[PDB]
Design a protein around this ligand. Sequence first.
Ligand SMILES: Nc1ncnc2c1ncn2[C@@H]1O[C@H](COP(=O)(O)OP(=O)(O)OP(=O)(O)O)[C@@H](O)[C@H]1O
Ligand SMILES: Nc1ncnc2c1ncn2[C@@H]1O[C@H](COP(=O)(O)OP(=O)(O)OP(=O)(O)O)[C@@H](O)[C@H]1O
Ligand SMILES: Nc1ncnc2c1ncn2[C@@H]1O[C@H](COP(=O)(O)OP(=O)(O)OP(=O)(O)O)[C@@H](O)[C@H]1O
Ligand SMILES: OC[C@H]1O[C@H](O[C@H]2[C@H](O)[C@@H](O)[C@@H](O)O[C@@H]2CO)[C@H](O)[C@@H](O)[C@@H]1O
Ligand SMILES: OC[C@H]1O[C@H](O[C@H]2[C@H](O)[C@@H](O)[C@@H](O)O[C@@H]2CO)[C@H](O)[C@@H](O)[C@@H]1O
Ligand SMILES: OC[C@H]1O[C@H](O[C@H]2[C@H](O)[C@@H](O)[C@@H](O)O[C@@H]2CO)[C@H](O)[C@@H](O)[C@@H]1O
Ligand SMILES: OC[C@H]1O[C@H](O[C@H]2[C@H](O)[C@@H](O)[C@@H](O)O[C@@H]2CO)[C@H](O)[C@@H](O)[C@@H]1O
Ligand SMILES: OC[C@H]1O[C@H](O[C@H]2[C@H](O)[C@@H](O)[C@@H](O)O[C@@H]2CO)[C@H](O)[C@@H](O)[C@@H]1O
Ligand SMILES: OC[C@H]1O[C@H](O[C@H]2[C@H](O)[C@@H](O)[C@@H](O)O[C@@H]2CO)[C@H](O)[C@@H](O)[C@@H]1O
Ligand SMILES: *[C@@H]1O[C@H](CO)[C@@H](O)[C@H](O)[C@H]1NC(C)=O
Ligand SMILES: *[C@@H]1O[C@H](CO)[C@@H](O)[C@H](O)[C@H]1NC(C)=O
Ligand SMILES: *[C@@H]1O[C@H](CO)[C@@H](O)[C@H](O)[C@H]1NC(C)=O
Ligand SMILES: *[C@@H]1O[C@H](CO)[C@@H](O)[C@H](O)[C@H]1NC(C)=O
Ligand SMILES: *[C@@H]1O[C@H](CO)[C@@H](O)[C@H](O)[C@H]1NC(C)=O
Ligand SMILES: *[C@@H]1O[C@H](CO)[C@@H](O)[C@H](O)[C@H]1NC(C)=O
Ligand SMILES: *[C@@H]1O[C@H](CO)[C@@H](O)[C@H](O)[C@H]1NC(C)=O
Ligand SMILES: *[C@@H]1O[C@H](CO)[C@@H](O)[C@H](O)[C@H]1NC(C)=O
Ligand SMILES: [Ca+2]
Ligand SMILES: [Ca+2]
Ligand SMILES: [Ca+2]
Lengths: 357, 357, 357
Amino acid sequence: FFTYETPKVIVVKSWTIGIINRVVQLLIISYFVGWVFLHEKAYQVRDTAIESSVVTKVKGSGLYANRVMDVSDYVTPPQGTSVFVIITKMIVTENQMQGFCPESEEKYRCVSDSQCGPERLPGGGILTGRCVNYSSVLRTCEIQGWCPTEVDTVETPIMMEAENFTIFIKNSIRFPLFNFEKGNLLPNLTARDMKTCRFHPDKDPFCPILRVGDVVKFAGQDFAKLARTGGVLGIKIGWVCDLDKAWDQCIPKYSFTRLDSVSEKSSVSPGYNFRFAKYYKMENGSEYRTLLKAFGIRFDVLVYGNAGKFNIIPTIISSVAAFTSVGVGTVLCDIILLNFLKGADQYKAKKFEEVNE
Amino acid sequence: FFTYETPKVIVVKSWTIGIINRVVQLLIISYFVGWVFLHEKAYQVRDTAIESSVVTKVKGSGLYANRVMDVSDYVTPPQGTSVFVIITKMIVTENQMQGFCPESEEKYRCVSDSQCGPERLPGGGILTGRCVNYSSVLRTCEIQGWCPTEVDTVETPIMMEAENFTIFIKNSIRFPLFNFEKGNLLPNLTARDMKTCRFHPDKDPFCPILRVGDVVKFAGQDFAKLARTGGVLGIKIGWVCDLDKAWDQCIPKYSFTRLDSVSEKSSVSPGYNFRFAKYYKMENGSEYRTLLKAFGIRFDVLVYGNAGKFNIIPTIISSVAAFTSVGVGTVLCDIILLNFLKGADQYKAKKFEEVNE
Amino acid sequence: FFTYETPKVIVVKSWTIGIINRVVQLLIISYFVGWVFLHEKAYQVRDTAIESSVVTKVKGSGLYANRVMDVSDYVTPPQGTSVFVIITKMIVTENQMQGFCPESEEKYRCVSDSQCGPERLPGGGILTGRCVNYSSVLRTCEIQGWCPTEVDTVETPIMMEAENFTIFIKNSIRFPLFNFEKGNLLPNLTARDMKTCRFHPDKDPFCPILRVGDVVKFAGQDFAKLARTGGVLGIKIGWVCDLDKAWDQCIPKYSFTRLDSVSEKSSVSPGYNFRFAKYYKMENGSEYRTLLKAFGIRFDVLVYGNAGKFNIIPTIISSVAAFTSVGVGTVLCDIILLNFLKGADQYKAKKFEEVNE
Ligand SMILES: Nc1ncnc2c1ncn2[C@@H]1O[C@H](COP(=O)(O)OP(=O)(O)OP(=O)(O)O)[C@@H](O)[C@H]1O
Ligand SMILES: Nc1ncnc2c1ncn2[C@@H]1O[C@H](COP(=O)(O)OP(=O)(O)OP(=O)(O)O)[C@@H](O)[C@H]1O
Ligand SMILES: Nc1ncnc2c1ncn2[C@@H]1O[C@H](COP(=O)(O)OP(=O)(O)OP(=O)(O)O)[C@@H](O)[C@H]1O
Ligand SMILES: OC[C@H]1O[C@H](O[C@H]2[C@H](O)[C@@H](O)[C@@H](O)O[C@@H]2CO)[C@H](O)[C@@H](O)[C@@H]1O
Ligand SMILES: OC[C@H]1O[C@H](O[C@H]2[C@H](O)[C@@H](O)[C@@H](O)O[C@@H]2CO)[C@H](O)[C@@H](O)[C@@H]1O
Ligand SMILES: OC[C@H]1O[C@H](O[C@H]2[C@H](O)[C@@H](O)[C@@H](O)O[C@@H]2CO)[C@H](O)[C@@H](O)[C@@H]1O
Ligand SMILES: OC[C@H]1O[C@H](O[C@H]2[C@H](O)[C@@H](O)[C@@H](O)O[C@@H]2CO)[C@H](O)[C@@H](O)[C@@H]1O
Ligand SMILES: OC[C@H]1O[C@H](O[C@H]2[C@H](O)[C@@H](O)[C@@H](O)O[C@@H]2CO)[C@H](O)[C@@H](O)[C@@H]1O
Ligand SMILES: OC[C@H]1O[C@H](O[C@H]2[C@H](O)[C@@H](O)[C@@H](O)O[C@@H]2CO)[C@H](O)[C@@H](O)[C@@H]1O
Ligand SMILES: *[C@@H]1O[C@H](CO)[C@@H](O)[C@H](O)[C@H]1NC(C)=O
Ligand SMILES: *[C@@H]1O[C@H](CO)[C@@H](O)[C@H](O)[C@H]1NC(C)=O
Ligand SMILES: *[C@@H]1O[C@H](CO)[C@@H](O)[C@H](O)[C@H]1NC(C)=O
Ligand SMILES: *[C@@H]1O[C@H](CO)[C@@H](O)[C@H](O)[C@H]1NC(C)=O
Ligand SMILES: *[C@@H]1O[C@H](CO)[C@@H](O)[C@H](O)[C@H]1NC(C)=O
Ligand SMILES: *[C@@H]1O[C@H](CO)[C@@H](O)[C@H](O)[C@H]1NC(C)=O
Ligand SMILES: *[C@@H]1O[C@H](CO)[C@@H](O)[C@H](O)[C@H]1NC(C)=O
Ligand SMILES: *[C@@H]1O[C@H](CO)[C@@H](O)[C@H](O)[C@H]1NC(C)=O
Ligand SMILES: [Ca+2]
Ligand SMILES: [Ca+2]
Ligand SMILES: [Ca+2]
């Protein structure tokens, strides 16, 4: 039987419960309108799956170890991806060749060939088992491998000029949910600007050229100390864009931070370095290498975003949930009505028809 | 007191509101079955935390600068991860040595040693302060650094053979939520296939070997132009899997796009190039290097996914939300019934027991 | 008119339906406290958008090709990022020069110059078009390019010592929504610890030093085979932290996996290798190179996390959803009461005030 049910309903008309209920309903409606609808923008579809493309190029020349270093010297790796290192300090061990020689760390002091056993395996090469004089004052165990051993201990200068190097970032982003593409280079960017522009969060925040020194500052770091220990900075690019607004309002927000934080909270491992070697060999077959311990700033360009564009389906479901939520005030209004007019017995009786068996 | 409450209810039996309510219920149920259940597949749990692995290897040989280039010559970096560059064009500066020489861009034209001060510090090397004859017609400032300076400007040919190179991808994906692992190399991949296979959207869509020219075509690019300016292409690998279906129906979908989008939309920064150097030294200790300004196509293999497998809890909560939603027709049924039969007063009186105090 | 509506309600008092409904309500409340509140911890805000930075440094020395290899030889690339390779096996093709020579894979068998045409376009250098003796028994096609050609096929040893190398990880993580930073190096780590500590999932899970052999074991991989074939293992670092709990309880979880899973289930692509060359050139201008086909284990240090901390708004809306959901038992209690008490007619009559017209 095609029959429509609906509840029998009391309809109190107290001025008190009337105004207090209407106020609770106003609060529910205004909360839903201002927060869930305007602020949390539930009337639109969101895309968080952003597609990004980063190309980098470092520029500047510097003095180090009586050489002029350009980008090809101090940038590692070279292909201009979203992570690169600018080397600020180098510990060179020139012309290592495969052979025999003693370690240089005091960690390996010896007087007898018997002390040189399978105890201290890492580092350099493999122990020959002998104990040999490294200097007039010290004897250490002898090893086979790249000779001479590097000294990890005496401090070298840092490349101050690196502070005035420039990082050019070229970022392309695409929101597929809205098939919307844009990049951090606006069409009114000129060659002349590129030649002279200066990124600053306030003074010029759209300039693709970033002074290393500026970035180090924005992250609150002392170039002098960071360049000595090495470390990692993040240049974050955020694209939070409401596509319901104007196309030219989808704009890049740059942020600057140091990522290897644990390092400062550590006296044991204070920075970021790595070791690699330049490989040569003579007209004789013999090979030799230049070993560099490289200290520098790693830069991660970090691109995130999320975009919203209005759609009818989310709006519809949000308004339906809104209407279904206007009802929830009834329980509080029940409590007020049934316990705050002295004649509560009247209302409990009016509303509740007891039964028993 | 162990008491069960339930409201007093009108139970109208008008044929009109009866059938209109039953039809509204049929529509709510059919939306929930067709949309929320079949389409949006709400009966299963979804996992997007996919685990992926990309291993790459390039093949091909070409003529450039009267040499045969193999992969080790044109692929950078070499380790065959999900991002790599295939170099298509090169502007070379042979045998740079550390020294003194004049700059070569007209950007540094001078007549006086006084123009060459500490003002235009980046690029090439460091100004020595003199102004030097660069050619019989031109004077530019002298610098200390890698000499001679690179000439940026004469356009060089591209490596046409690069079009016919092959990119081999090896992708492993794993869904931890369902402990389901699979890769883009289907168990029916044979050696003979590998020897001749052919990625093609139609003819061989599971061939792990992709022609560069193909991929460039697929991104809607002209190899000539891309090989001239450089760029970044994305090879996307999708694992959209309905695990309720067959294990052998979990299949990879290849899709092709150019990620450095801003570049064609820009007159200032039109492609992708980078600079790196081959470091040598004479039998004498003397160092010399080959400076390469490298133009090429960047490929990043992009693996995303989501799989769903049925679970009981999503079905339970969706059916619970269904029943809690079946009522929602009542507000519309109320307005129609309670305001469109002229004798609406009957229903108001039967339903509404007014009160006053 | 500020008027409050509310439904009229039956109020059964049967002991039976009283306890059965009260039990259903107890079960809903206990589930909501135990599941949605204790387990799924809905009283707190979650952030998964963790920012992470990894720096690695590999250590150990080993014998390969009758040389001692240190980190600068076998780790690639060298900058100490979240992905690196420890090379375990090498197939070297020494002193290659650009020239003419026949191929060395049997894939290029020939007897006549007519077989070597533009027919088999890929691979090696360019076919010179002639057919030349490769061996006393076999003839292959001649190519222009780096000579002699590499033979991929003769089996070489592995660097057994690689098993005993050590990977040092330094991970910095940041939950930005709660602006909480920490690292995997706890402040009570000493130099002495670093010198001798030993990572173990149970005994010392905070030692940042992981023996490669251990990592290979933990991923359920056999060093000998992984080192022969090459492969990819994942080192995942998880930060599951309840900030409501103790601060020194935000702790990293190590997990070990092989990511290139497709490799073992496949007869086509069994490991991980790549090729690169050491570049030299004579005192004559002419270049010659050492070609290495490099086999090793790739390492991805994989950092995920999510933190939850109590907030009032999630607690409020969960308690609200709890109370609004407690009602749902009424439908089942209706069916039970109105059809399983013999006096169902009493309640049908009490509750339902029919209408007809
Ligand atoms: N770090 C940087 N500092 C200043 N300008 C830069 C930097 N990187 C790139 N540019 C400039 O931005 C413009 C576009 O960069 P791009 O490298 O794509 O062009 P290019 O002609 O290859 O550059 P270049 O010839 O200067 O190496 C160029 O004019 C270049 O001079
Ligand atoms: N793979 C490893 N195995 C054991 N200890 C290591 C390893 N890597 C680093 N350490 C220890 O932790 C310390 C911090 O390393 P970091 O690279 O930050 O600086 P470093 O002193 O130049 O390293 P090293 O002296 O090993 O070259 C190191 O000095 C070293 O003693
Ligand atoms: N870019 C490519 N084009 C064509 N074939 C490829 C390519 N990459 C790999 N292959 C083939 O796929 C197989 C899997 O590659 P894998 O590197 O695992 O083996 P491999 O022995 O090192 O290959 P090869 O030595 O022949 O390059 C190889 O036998 C190789 O022939
Ligand atoms: O998911 C958490 C929630 O946080 C933010 O909301 C804040 C709000 O910004 C503040 O004004 C504060 O007073 O109230 C909220 C605390 O929960 C975001 O605005 C919101 O989008 C985000 O979801
Ligand atoms: O592109 C025009 C655009 O108009 C509408 O945009 C509105 C939007 O609804 C509001 O949120 C506001 O912030 O911006 C506009 C009104 O000033 C719609 O987004 C859409 O129909 C259309 O694309
Ligand atoms: O809630 C957003 C919604 O977006 C998409 O829904 C599509 C639907 O799939 C199309 O068939 C179209 O006709 O209607 C909607 C308009 O976007 C997603 O399919 C879905 O996952 C998501 O719920
Ligand atoms: O193939 C065995 C498989 O059977 C079941 O899968 C069903 C699935 O649940 C249904 O949605 C239906 O549409 O397709 C499948 C039948 O092919 C279960 O998943 C399980 O028993 C098992 O995995
Ligand atoms: O169902 C997805 C679910 O997985 C986990 O929940 C578990 C729960 O932890 C166990 O106690 C079990 O008995 O019930 C569920 C079945 O897996 C996750 O904890 C949870 O986040 C997720 O929703
Ligand atoms: O200690 C400050 C911290 O207190 C709160 O954490 C509580 C938590 O809610 C309780 O469940 C209890 O078990 O642990 C803590 C009490 O010591 C909040 O997390 C937060 O307001 C505050 O930071
Ligand atoms: C940066 O350049 C300015 C002007 O060329 C100079 O005064 C300053 O010393 C430079 N910074 C460093 C760290 O050398
Ligand atoms: C280019 O136009 C945009 C659009 O509003 C504007 O923000 C910007 O200032 C313009 N470019 C420059 C260099 O001022
Ligand atoms: C190779 O010749 C050089 C001299 O140019 C010499 O230093 C080196 O010791 C020779 N190699 C061997 C193994 O003797
Ligand atoms: C690419 O290969 C096709 C056939 O495989 C050939 O016709 C074409 O000439 C090749 N392109 C180049 C630049 O060699
Ligand atoms: C391999 O299997 C896929 C589906 O799993 C099928 O489409 C394809 O035809 C198969 N290839 C061969 C050579 O049978
Ligand atoms: C690795 O070290 C262990 C114990 O220190 C030793 O037993 C084993 O022989 C070593 N293996 C190699 C290849 O050096
Ligand atoms: C350092 O503290 C952590 C946690 O507070 C603890 O697990 C570890 O045992 C401590 N270190 C030592 C050397 O005991
Ligand atoms: C360069 O010199 C080497 C020997 O030093 C010789 O083998 C080679 O053929 C020469 N080539 C040219 C082009 O001079
Ligand atoms: Ca040391
Ligand atoms: Ca230029
Ligand atoms: Ca081969």
